[PDB]
Amino acid sequence: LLDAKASEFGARMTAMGNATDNATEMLETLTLQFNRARQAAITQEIAEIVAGANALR
Amino acid sequence: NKGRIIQVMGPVVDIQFESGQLPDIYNAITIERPQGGTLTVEAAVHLGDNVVRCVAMASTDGLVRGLEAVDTGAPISVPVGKATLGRVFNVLGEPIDEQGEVNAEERHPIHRPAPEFEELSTADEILETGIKVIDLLAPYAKGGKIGLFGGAGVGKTVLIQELINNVAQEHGGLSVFAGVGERTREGNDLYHEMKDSGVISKTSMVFGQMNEPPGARLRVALTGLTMAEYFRDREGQDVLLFIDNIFRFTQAGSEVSALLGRMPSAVGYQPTLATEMGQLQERITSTKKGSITSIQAIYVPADDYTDPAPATTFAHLDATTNLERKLAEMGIYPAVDPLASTSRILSPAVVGEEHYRVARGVQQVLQRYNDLQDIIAILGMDELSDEDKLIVARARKIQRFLSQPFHVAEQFTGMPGKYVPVKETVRGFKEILEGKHDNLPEEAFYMVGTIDEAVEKAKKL
Amino acid sequence: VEVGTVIQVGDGIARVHGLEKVMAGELLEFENGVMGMAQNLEEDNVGVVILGPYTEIREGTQVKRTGRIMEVPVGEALLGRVVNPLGQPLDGRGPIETAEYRPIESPAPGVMDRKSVHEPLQTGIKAIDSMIPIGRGQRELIIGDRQTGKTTIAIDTIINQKGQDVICIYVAIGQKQSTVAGVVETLRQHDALDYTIVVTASASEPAPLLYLAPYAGCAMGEYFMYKGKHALVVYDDLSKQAAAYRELSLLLRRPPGREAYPGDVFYLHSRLLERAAKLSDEKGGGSLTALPFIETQAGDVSAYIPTNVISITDGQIFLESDLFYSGVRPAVNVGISVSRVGGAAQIKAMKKVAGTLRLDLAQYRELQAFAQFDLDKATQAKLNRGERTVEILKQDEHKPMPVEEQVISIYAVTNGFMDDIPVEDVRRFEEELLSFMRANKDSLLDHIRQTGELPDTKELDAAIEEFKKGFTPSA
Amino acid sequence: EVGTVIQVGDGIARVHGLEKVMAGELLEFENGVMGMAQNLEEDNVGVVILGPYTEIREGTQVKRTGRIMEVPVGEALLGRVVNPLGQPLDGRGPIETAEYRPIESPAPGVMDRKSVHEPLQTGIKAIDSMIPIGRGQRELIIGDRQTGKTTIAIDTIINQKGQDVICIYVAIGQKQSTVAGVVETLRQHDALDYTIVVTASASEPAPLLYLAPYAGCAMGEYFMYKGKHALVVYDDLSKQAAAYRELSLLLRRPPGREAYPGDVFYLHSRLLERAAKLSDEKGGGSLTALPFIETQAGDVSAYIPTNVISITDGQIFLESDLFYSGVRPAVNVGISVSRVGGAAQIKAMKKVAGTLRLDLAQYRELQAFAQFGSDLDKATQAKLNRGERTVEILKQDEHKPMPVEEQVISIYAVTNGFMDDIPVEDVRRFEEELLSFMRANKDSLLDHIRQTGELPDTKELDAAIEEFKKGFTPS
Numbered sequence A: 001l002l003d004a005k006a007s008e009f010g011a012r013m014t015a016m017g018n019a020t021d022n023a024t025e026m027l028e029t030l031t032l033q034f035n036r037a038r039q040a041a042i043t044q045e046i047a048e049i050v051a052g053a054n055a056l057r
Numbered sequence B: 001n002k003g004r005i006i007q008v009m010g011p012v013v014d015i016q017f018e019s020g021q022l023p024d025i026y027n028a029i030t031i032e033r034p035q036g037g038t039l040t041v042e043a044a045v046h047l048g049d050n051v052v053r054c055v056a057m058a059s060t061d062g063l064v065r066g067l068e069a070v071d072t073g074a075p076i077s078v079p080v081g082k083a084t085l086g087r088v089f090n091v092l093g094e095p096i097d098e099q100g101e102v103n104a105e106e107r108h109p110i111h112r113p114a115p116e117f118e119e120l121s122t123a124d125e126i127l128e129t130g131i132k133v134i135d136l137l138a139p140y141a142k143g144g145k146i147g148l149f150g151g152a153g154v155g156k157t158v159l160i161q162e163l164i165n166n167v168a169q170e171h172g173g174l175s176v177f178a179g180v181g182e183r184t185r186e187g188n189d190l191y192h193e194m195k196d197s198g199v200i201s202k203t204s205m206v207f208g209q210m211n212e213p214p215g216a217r218l219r220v221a222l223t224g225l226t227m228a229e230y231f232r233d234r235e236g237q238d239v240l241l242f243i244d245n246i247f248r249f250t251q252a253g254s255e256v257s258a259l260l261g262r263m264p265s266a267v268g269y270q271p272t273l274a275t276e277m278g279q280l281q282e283r284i285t286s287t288k289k290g291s292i293t294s295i296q297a298i299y300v301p302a303d304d305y306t307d308p309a310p311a312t313t314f315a316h317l318d319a320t321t322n323l324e325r326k327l328a329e330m331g332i333y334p335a336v337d338p339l340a341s342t343s344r345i346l347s348p349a350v351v352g353e354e355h356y357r358v359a360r361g362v363q364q365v366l367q368r369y370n371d372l373q374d375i376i377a378i379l380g381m382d383e384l385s386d387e388d389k390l391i392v393a394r395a396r397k398i399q400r401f402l403s404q405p406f407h408v409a410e411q412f413t414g415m416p417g418k419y420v421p422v423k424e425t426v427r428g429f430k431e432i433l434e435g436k437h438d439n440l441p442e443e444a445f446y447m448v449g450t451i452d453e454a455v456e457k458a459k460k461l
Numbered sequence C: 001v002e003v004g005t006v007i008q009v010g011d012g013i014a015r016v017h018g019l020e021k022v023m024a025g026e027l028l029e030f031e032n033g034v035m036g037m038a039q040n041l042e043e044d045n046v047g048v049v050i051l052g053p054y055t056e057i058r059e060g061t062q063v064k065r066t067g068r069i070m071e072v073p074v075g076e077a078l079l080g081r082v083v084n085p086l087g088q089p090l091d092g093r094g095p096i097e098t099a100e101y102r103p104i105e106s107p108a109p110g111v112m113d114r115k116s117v118h119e120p121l122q123t124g125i126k127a128i129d130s131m132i133p134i135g136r137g138q139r140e141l142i143i144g145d146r147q148t149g150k151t152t153i154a155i156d157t158i159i160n161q162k163g164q165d166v167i168c169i170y171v172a173i174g175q176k177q178s179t180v181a182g183v184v185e186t187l188r189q190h191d192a193l194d195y196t197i198v199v200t201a202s203a204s205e206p207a208p209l210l211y212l213a214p215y216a217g218c219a220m221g222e223y224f225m226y227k228g229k230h231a232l233v234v235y236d237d238l239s240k241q242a243a244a245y246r247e248l249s250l251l252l253r254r255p256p257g258r259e260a261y262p263g264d265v266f267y268l269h270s271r272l273l274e275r276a277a278k279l280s281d282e283k284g285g286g287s288l289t290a291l292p293f294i295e296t297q298a299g300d301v302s303a304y305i306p307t308n309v310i311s312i313t314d315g316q317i318f319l320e321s322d323l324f325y326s327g328v329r330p331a332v333n334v335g336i337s338v339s340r341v342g343g344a345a346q347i348k349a350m351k352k353v354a355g356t357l358r359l360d361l362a363q364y365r366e367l368q369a370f371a372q373f374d375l376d377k378a379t380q381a382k383l384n385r386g387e388r389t390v391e392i393l394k395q396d397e398h399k400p401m402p403v404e405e406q407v408i409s410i411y412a413v414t415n416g417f418m419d420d421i422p423v424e425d426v427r428r429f430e431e432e433l434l435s436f437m438r439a440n441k442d443s444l445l446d447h448i449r450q451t452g453e454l455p456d457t458k459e460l461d462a463a464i465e466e467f468k469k470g471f472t473p474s475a
Numbered sequence D: 001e002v003g004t005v006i007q008v009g010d011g012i013a014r015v016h017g018l019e020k021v022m023a024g025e026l027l028e029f030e031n032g033v034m035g036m037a038q039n040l041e042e043d044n045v046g047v048v049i050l051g052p053y054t055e056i057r058e059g060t061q062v063k064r065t066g067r068i069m070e071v072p073v074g075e076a077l078l079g080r081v082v083n084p085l086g087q088p089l090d091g092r093g094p095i096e097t098a099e100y101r102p103i104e105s106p107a108p109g110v111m112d113r114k115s116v117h118e119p120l121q122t123g124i125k126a127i128d129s130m131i132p133i134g135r136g137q138r139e140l141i142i143g144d145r146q147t148g149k150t151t152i153a154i155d156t157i158i159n160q161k162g163q164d165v166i167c168i169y170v171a172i173g174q175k176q177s178t179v180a181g182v183v184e185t186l187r188q189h190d191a192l193d194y195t196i197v198v199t200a201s202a203s204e205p206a207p208l209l210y211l212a213p214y215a216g217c218a219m220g221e222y223f224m225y226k227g228k229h230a231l232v233v234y235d236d237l238s239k240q241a242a243a244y245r246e247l248s249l250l251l252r253r254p255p256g257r258e259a260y261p262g263d264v265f266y267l268h269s270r271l272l273e274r275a276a277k278l279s280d281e282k283g284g285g286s287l288t289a290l291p292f293i294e295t296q297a298g299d300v301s302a303y304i305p306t307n308v309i310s311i312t313d314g315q316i317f318l319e320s321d322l323f324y325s326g327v328r329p330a331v332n333v334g335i336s337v338s339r340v341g342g343a344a345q346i347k348a349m350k351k352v353a354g355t356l357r358l359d360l361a362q363y364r365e366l367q368a369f370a371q372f373g374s375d376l377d378k379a380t381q382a383k384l385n386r387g388e389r390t391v392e393i394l395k396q397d398e399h400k401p402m403p404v405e406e407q408v409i410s411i412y413a414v415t416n417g418f419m420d421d422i423p424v425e426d427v428r429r430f431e432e433e434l435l436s437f438m439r440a441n442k443d444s445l446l447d448h449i450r451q452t453g454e455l456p457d458t459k460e461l462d463a464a465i466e467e468f469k470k471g472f473t474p475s
């Protein structure tokens, strides 16, 4: 039982160590997507304002 | 003073008048149509060369360049007093109910300055709605400013109709309803509903719906407000002001903005958003002379509360009912956000120490549930502690007991509506926090009135 | 004022000098017979939008006033014909012989001209008719991504009006014409074409005709509404109509707003869909029911044009790809989809059996997602019930179910008559049950047909139990 | 001298003539309404109207004053409610004063200042301990709506009672009945008689919202340059920015990010730099600024927030998650900054606050282990027990500002471990009774902190707390 418990907790270290490394990989991918959308949103918003102003003049 | 049309650009019309004979800004100007009938337009901008740019209150189709335009010499004036009660109006204050003339004492202009700082006060007395989520977590005040925020199809109209059914039914004073840029079906539904219940006799109705051009939707709220302002100031009686939907005033202004010659602001809105909103909103208030309890539906475009229109509206309110789609998507109606909904009178001084403690207890349990949702979703339910598992169980029951069947929504719920007193509501959520209904299933709490009805419902399951 | 001259032209947008006293939004006729529409009355020139081919319209081309607004043919002659937004036939079966005409622009019925929506428009689809019911005079948006089953719902609805005395109008906007030809053939094969008008403004047409197509189809439906008859109109779709209006506005140099659309893009669809209504008994009691379409991009219901049309209509049917490919067809999202008429648009039998159905299944789908993260008895019973109810709401394309048969199927599953049946056998159980009820227990079905109410529940419970004795489950 | 109006609209008038007008000059229309020359163009003067414009027309005449905008200043404005022009709104008669100052005024230079060394006590334990504000500092209060921003400013103003500090609450874009509620709260807590209230409500013209902070700044500067100390609150600069945007867009100055002009940063930096701590040679007076920013959904990287964050000396970030949990005031200590830091604190607070910021950082960092109860080692066990107890001390009720001497003893007690024995739910009651015990019996320890600004004998203080701790009854 004690040896099986040692194997259980060791297996949980590895599995949750991988899940931590996988989470950091995904967190970077999401941060790239966010900053892609943030930059695209500001580019579009300001372009529509300037386009609207040029239509009057 | 007579003028001549030089341009027609959709809802905007440019009229050249004679030198030194210009209408003032906001003056009503009449134009006789070639087809037959009269078109009222409102003066907006003095362009120069004796030209006045005007926003039309009806369709400009059929107009021709060169037609005569006549200055009325004043703003759009509409009937006031007890002749308006029981009647249905349009933006110009004309009767659209097909029940003869309106023998009013006076006709006041729709434009008006806001009240003085000296005239104003705060709203401290609670107003019982009979809706659990509102009365507990974000209660309304008598003579105060209420706002019903929500996205497209989350439940603003169903909520305001329920507040008419609950509050305005046994109301000693008078009422005003303003239909602003919304569905004409709903105006017909509400009129016949008020006619059946007998509330129509206490209520003046105005309608300028989404079929109408922008100018009509821009000024229709002022027509209704002017009637409410009469009942506040001149007569000694309490007023209920229902507006559905106030957003459409801002949107109507946004439609005409570029044609008036104004450069656009952020998110496609007019640069004068805050000023135009404030000059309308600050008139909607209680004073030392009289009490107006204003309840306004507020559309949130794209479910985005950061949008300039609803964001700017928040400053004008004493209580806010914040509807969210994610609650409505589950079937939780009314879909009221228990955290983001707020009230100025949520404090021990007004509602008592028990009410405030129970209301705050509900918010902490629901806050903790939201923090755990993203953790539970990936890592699972059984990895939590015994305290958190109990919090999750009670939060889901609390969230379902916050739901409620409405009298006006029987055709959607498929069951009878329920009215729940405040002391009964506080008792119900208190017993759930203390843990007295932990063995009842979740569905027992869903769509009921009192906590007693939840105990009875659990036996059926 | 007598005759104008084209001073400049390009992209189907002429500019005319000479017409002094022309009306705002007036119909004009060019030299070669092609029509036009005068948009804005500026001081010097007049911006004219050409409603046809602009190959032979050069500089110096003569233009003349008609003294009228834009107008289309209407009536019984259009039934079973394929026309353009102007009313001209494309099927090649001779001219449209009719004396009745109606305008493109026409006001909606006011607050006193309407009666509350109280009469069903049966689609024959269980998911719609039970949870998101459409009534005569209602506007119900059909919204979702490409290839989610939007058109199929509209075509099946049209087919289900066979013998119900409801004139259908299918308005195609911006489609390829071979797909519209395929739709005409599908209506022909199911014998729905006799009472259907096919308006089409294909992708090769100028933008003004795409812009004008829903208003033409609306005018063809309004004819029957104001006569006291009932009509259904489908706009497939308004995304391409709005895009054609955007093109029109930008070519006329009107100021752009969000996604380059003009400021009155909400107003475009609001005045269109407000004309769909249920008239009062005082004004004849007729109706025009509207099925506008929106194509979302990647399920984005919160985009600019989708939320405008959601905010106009009396609810929406939202379809999704993940539901579609997982086996849920029709792929209706119960949480996002809603009907704003509701129980008023259902018969009393359907109202009683399916009154709380959408709210129950909304709670089920949340509970299903939460359950994945060993449950208790009462909660597990709700999941088992909901899972069986989901199988009942599944339905194949072009297989309409009469409302009486829908009531029995929904009554059976919601009162626990399929709890002892496995989940995989629920659809076969349904087909065999209804086949049993049609053959042997038709008086129970007929009670719902004639009265509109449920039969005696004692007798109905016994009839279902009688069927179950001859049902063999596979598991 | 004289000029005539060409065009009028939306609180803006373009004027022919006025050839020798100054940029920013005060103008008078023929009906008595005032204006300000913002745009000097080749053929006209763009004038922003400081009042109603319905009586202003084409042909209306405008006069030069030859002066910039001034406001009344001094002791007469104390206890009064005024608009940005200095006109009384409370209905309590005129404002008798000989002293006047310009709205636009240059800030003190680099050589006119002395380092910020004097505390401005807010009376709020979380702010005074870990995000300390000094006299002359500009500290931003930033967060979403209903996070407790206004309360912090009102409680700061109330705490200045009997400290010889003139407060100035500038309200921009608020509902006027909400401003009436604020002055009543100040009246009830005896805070109004040393406070000036400048209000430009939402119904006021856009130029008054634009000019409101500068008017309030000038009123604060009067006391600064006379050798006294003052506090100014701008509630808020988001609505001020939007009001200046309105005028710039109406005057057709080019738009940028969120439609703001290129001088909106310059607008706020010119305002906030006028708040300062003067040198001994210049009298030693000061103006402390508390600008507000209302963020939308926590977006601190939005344009106007980004501007005011970089301009100021520090930020007090508030958050909704903390507010709903019961952490009130809802101050996020991790991201909140005070660049002045220890220099703005007395020696007693500086010493005790070092352990407090260390303990609170480690608690919220190691909060993932909190659910895993009694599995942890004793090192992280005691830090979680200490951490959750310090959170309860940092909680504080509405309108109850604490004296600095009472704050340091409360922080000293929790950080040295005198509340580890007492339960978590009893920490706030333990605090209130401890300070009641210290005020009554052990006043000599309190008075030492008042006089010297340092901690008393630590072993004597430890003995005083232990006497109370035995008399206390847990639950």
Ligand SMILES: Nc1ncnc2c1ncn2[C@@H]1O[C@H](COP(=O)(O)OP(=O)(O)O)[C@@H](O)[C@H]1O
Binding pocket: B150, B151, B152, B153, B154, B155, B156, B157, B158, B159, B333, B334, B335, B405, B406, B409, B412, B413, C338, C339, C340, C341, C342
């Ligand atoms: N309290 C409620 N109970 C049951 N269903 C509701 C409730 N509120 C809204 N709904 C559902 O959502 C639909 C939209 O409500 P509505 O008030 O028209 O939304 P909006 O916020 O756009 O005004 C209703 O027709 C109904 O089907």
Ligand SMILES: Nc1ncnc2c1ncn2[C@@H]1O[C@H](COP(=O)(O)OP(=O)(O)O)[C@@H](O)[C@H]1O
Binding pocket: C144, C145, C146, C147, C148, C149, C150, C151, C152, C153, C329, C330, C395, C396, C397
């Ligand atoms: N209930 C259904 N069962 C099976 N297939 C369906 C069903 N509804 C639609 N489909 C299929 O989905 C595809 C797309 O249908 P369509 O109505 O053209 O979607 P959309 O108009 O949204 O692009 C078609 O091939 C059609 O056969």
Ligand SMILES: Nc1ncnc2c1ncn2[C@@H]1O[C@H](COP(=O)(O)OP(=O)(O)O)[C@@H](O)[C@H]1O
Binding pocket: B343, B344, D143, D144, D145, D146, D147, D148, D149, D150, D151, D152, D328, D329, D396, D397, D398
């Ligand atoms: N420390 C506190 N304890 C309890 N309630 C508070 C506290 N601080 C603020 N509140 C309450 O919470 C609400 C927060 O709103 P407010 O102070 O106006 O902040 P904001 O200006 O950001 O909206 C107020 O109604 C106030 O009564």
Ligand SMILES: [Mg+2]
Binding pocket: B156, B157, B182
């Ligand atoms: Mg609504």
Ligand SMILES: [Mg+2]
Binding pocket: C150, C151, C236
């Ligand atoms: Mg399709």
Ligand SMILES: [Mg+2]
Binding pocket: D149, D150, D235
């Ligand atoms: Mg505030």
